[PDB]
């Protein structure tokens, strides 16, 4: 039974997400004091980004870059900082090194992508821009999303040096030593009503028919029927005894719809 129609539903959100205030900020923080901005209750238009060829790195794990505009998340976290050109590589799950041990970290199940671009023309001076710092050593590697903002001193041999060190960004340095602005987006999975979604428009509901449904990112094929199940305010999807999604809550009309297979029993074609 081929789906005869497509049903796409999104919550009634009109505000555009403030991505411009992060990617175009006048000042960026250092790695040891990376700035996190919470994004919620807005429509995420990712065409402002991918279309720009400015980004040198755009690697999303757990989600597809081309399917970002079609997904919905509870919250999106925007983290921004400045590192070296040869060090942008350490911004990835499972990676170890100076960034990923004492001043930043991404978990093994990280969902989201980092965006990095060359900022020499803004953060590199002829005499050297020494307003960006990095932390060579901390006692223990850092939990993944921990921030170390303390100014403490560490011991090398018999000399007491400072944990934080100047990056030294020059305009005559190689791309491996040039400054890079890194912005990442952390996607929180659906445990509450979706607040960040794409710019797509909600479609009309079609019941009792085999159609392709897309409820806040949940894509599948089935027949939508009225459901007697009562969902909690924080519940969006229902699962049967076999851990299969059999009921979904409509984000626009706040009603519960049962999901059934389009065919029952074995079907043979002659």
């Amino acid at each position: 039974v081929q789906p005869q129609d497509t049903v796409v539903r999104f919550p009634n959100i009109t505000n555009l997400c403030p991505f411009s205030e992060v990617f175009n900020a006048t000042t960026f923080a250092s790695v040891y004091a990376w700035n996190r901005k919470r994004i919620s209750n807005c429509v995420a238009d990712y065409s402002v980004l991918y279309n720009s060829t400015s980004f040198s790195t755009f690697q999303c794990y757990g989600v597809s870059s081309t399917k970002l505009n079609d997904l919905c998340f509870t919250n999106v976290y925007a983290d921004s900082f400045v590192v070296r050109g040869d060090e942008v590589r350490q911004i990835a799950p499972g990676q170890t090194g100076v960034i990923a041990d004492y001043n930043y970290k991404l978990p093994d199940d990280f969902t989201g992508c980092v965006l990095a671009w060359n900022s020499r023309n803004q953060d590199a001076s002829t005499s050297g821009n020494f307003n960006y710092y990095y932390r060579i050593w901390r006692s223990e590697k850092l939990r993944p999303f921990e921030r170390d903002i303390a100014h403490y001193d560490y011991q090398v041999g018999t000399q007491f040096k400072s944990s934080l060190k100047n990056y030294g960004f020059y305009s005559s340095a190689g791309d491996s030593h040039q400054p890079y602005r890194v912005v990442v987006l952390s996607f929180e999975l659906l445990n509450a009503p979706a607040t960040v979604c794409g710019p797509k428009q909600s479609t009309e509901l079609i019941k009792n028919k085999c159609v392709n449904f897309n409820f806040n990112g949940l894509t599948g094929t089935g027949v939508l029927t009225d459901s007697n199940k009562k969902f909690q305010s924080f519940q969006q999807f229902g699962r049967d005894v076999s851990d299969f999604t059999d009921s979904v809550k409509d984000p626009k009309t706040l009603e519960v719809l049962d999901i059934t297979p389009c065919s029952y029993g074995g079907v043979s074609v002659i």
């Binding site: 050593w137 040096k161 340095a173 791309d175």
Partner: protein, 596 residues
């Protein structure tokens, strides 16, 4: 915390501040060498004083971590580099005196002049008054005047200082736990292989003597051929079965016999391979020279030059009114900044110099990943050897034929090969005995085999035996003929050129075997060979992180210095020399002298 743990923390902090101070010192040096001014020299000195003070302070602390407790070779090699130097042992009076002795020896060499017998007011400085005479003059007595005058005014003045220099230098080396100053110089080739006994400085001496014994036949035949040509040039002054006078070697000291090519040319009718006129005709400039060098390096798979290299380098002499140092130099400032400061002109010599200097930037763009301390050629020779191999690959007539610089109608017959090989021998084979003998004399002086009462006697006996060269006039212990050379008067090692030639020809043979080149070894180009480029990049990437013996085994298949590739390169020249030396005499007598 293990000693290794503390060593890693110390080395990390060291690389952080070291990259910071070095880049700034390199920036100051670049500004001064590109803009000559008292203000710039002031900045350079301040940057260098800061770097030297920091390096000394860090070297003193690095001795807190014994190399034994260290397990990782990388950390152990960094700690060895820091602990070897960075802390003088001479007393304050002795340190000041040494500095004064060194500065005086440099001043005398720079201001040294030889004034004519008839006209005391007419005088000639080494550059280029005296050097032109040795390089071009063919008047036996004029070259004798220049040679003896340079010795009398320079050696005699440096004689009392050089004696004191040896006493102070040996003392500093002993404070570094070495036998003498020569032993301290040989520490570069010392390695600690984990699979068994490695390389020692005494092994370096054994290898250089054995390699000289192996080069002696080819050098003996080249010496005989040059002696016959000089008998044609200077009659009534050369003995058919004797040594060659020192002042007739085309140079103040006869380090290179290149200037004797006009007299010793095998076939004068056949010309050279100069393409300067073709370079000028096609409107070539420095930009095209360096772009063609980049095309050559990118063909074997080496990375392209960085945009900062093209935007920050001095590839031409500035015309705005800025005085510059015109000597070619490839720069590695740090932080990925690679530049070349060179007075590029439209000539074949500048083309090959551009390839050689770009060969330096290509070895530096590989070891860059290595820590700062290990960012250096495996040994003093490996680096220069890499540049020379590049120059050899690009100078082949076939390669110039591809570029359009050489006409396709040119034919490579045997006579042209003999001329090119003889010129290469005059610049390469004619230098090995001189370098080996000079370094052996310096080693024996530092150790104590030759007392000052016998410095000139042994120097002239060793020169007659090893180099086959006799002094035109008798010299007493008031002379310091070795000190008349820049390297000896300015405290520089000299065996690096010997090892550079050996390693260069070993690399050439290895990469030519990889490039599947069939034919003479001197007609080999590694262009468009990704396998040869891959093994070369593997050789350049390690830097000083591993023993140079292993690197050599990885690239050429052998871990021992070998002159076999060098002899195979000059095999046609050796055959032609043996053909020309049937009626002549091969060898020399150490009894004949021009003044007896």
């Amino acid at each position: 915390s293990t000693t290794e743990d503390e060593a890693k923390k110390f080395l990390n902090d060291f690389n952080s501040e070291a990259e910071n101070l070095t880049y700034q010192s390199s920036l100051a040096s670049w500004d001064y060498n590109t803009n000559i001014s008292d203000e710039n020299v002031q900045k350079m000195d301040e940057a260098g004083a800061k770097w030297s003070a920091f390096y000394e302070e860090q070297s003193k602390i690095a001795k807190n971590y014994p190399l034994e407790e260290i397990q990782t070779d990388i950390v152990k090699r960094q700690l060895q580099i820091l602990q070897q130097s960075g802390s003088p042992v001479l007393s304050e009076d002795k340190s000041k005196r040494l500095n004064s002795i060194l500065n005086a020896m440099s001043t005398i060499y720079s201001t040294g002049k030889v004034c004519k017998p008839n006209n005391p007011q007419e005088c000639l400085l080494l550059e280029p008054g005296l050097d032109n005479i040795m390089g071009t003059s063919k008047d036996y007595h004029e070259r004798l005047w220049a040679w003896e005058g340079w010795r009398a005014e320079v050696g005699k003045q440096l004689r009392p200082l050089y004696e004191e220099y040896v006493v102070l230098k040996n003392e500093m080396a002993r404070g570094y736990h070495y036998e003498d100053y020569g032993d301290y110089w040989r520490r570069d080739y010392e390695t600690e292989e984990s699979s068994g006994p490695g390389y020692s400085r005494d092994q370096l001496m054994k290898d250089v003597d054995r390699i000289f014994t192996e080069i002696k036949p080819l050098y003996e035949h080249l010496h005989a051929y040059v002696r016959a040509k000089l008998m044609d040039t200077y009659p009534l002054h050369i003995s058919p079965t004797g040594c060659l006078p020192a002042h007739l070697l085309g140079d103040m000291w006869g380090r290179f016999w290149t200037n004797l090519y006009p007299l010793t040319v095998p076939f004068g009718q056949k010309p050279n391979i100069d393409v300067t006129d073709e370079m000028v005709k096609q409107g070539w400039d420095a930009n095209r020279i360096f772009k063609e060098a980049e095309k050559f390096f990118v063909s074997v798979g080496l990375p392209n030059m960085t945009e900062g290299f093209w935007n920050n380098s001095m590839l031409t002499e500035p015309g705005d009114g800025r005085k510059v140092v015109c000597h070619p130099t490839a720069w590695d400032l740090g932080k990925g900044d690679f530049r070349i400061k060179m007075c590029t002109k439209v000539t074949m010599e500048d083309f090959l110099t551009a390839h050689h200097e770009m060969g330096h930037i290509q070895y530096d763009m590989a070891y860059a990943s290595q820590p700062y301390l290990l960012r250096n050629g495996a040994n003093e020779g490996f680096h220069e050897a890499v540049g020379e191999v590049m120059s050899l690959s690009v100078a082949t007539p076939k390669h110039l034929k591809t570029m359009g610089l050489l006409s396709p109608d040119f034919r490579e017959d045997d006579e042209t090969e003999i001329n090119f090989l003889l010129k290469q021998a005059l610049n390469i084979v004619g230098t090995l005995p001189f370098t080996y003998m000079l370094e052996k004399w310096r080693w024996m002086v530092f150790k104590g085999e030759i007392p000052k009462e016998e410095w000139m006697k042994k120097w002239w006996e060793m020169r007659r035996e090893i180099v086959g060269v006799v002094e035109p006039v008798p010299h007493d212990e008031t002379y310091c003929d070795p000190a008349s050379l820049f390297h000896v008067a300015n405290d520089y090692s000299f065996i690096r050129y010997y090892t550079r030639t050996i390693f260069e020809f070993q690399f050439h043979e290895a990469l030519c075997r990889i490039a599947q080149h069939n034919g003479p070894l001197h007609k080999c180009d590694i262009s468009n060979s990704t396998d040869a480029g891959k093994k070369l990049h593997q050789m350049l990437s390690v830097g000083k992180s591993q023993a140079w013996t292993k690197t050599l085994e990885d690239i050429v298949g052998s871990r021992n210095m070998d002159v076999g590739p060098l002899l195979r390169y000059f095999e046609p020249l050796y055959t032609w020399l043996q053909e020309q030396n049937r009626k002549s005499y091969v060898g020399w007598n150490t009894d004949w002298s021009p003044y007896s």
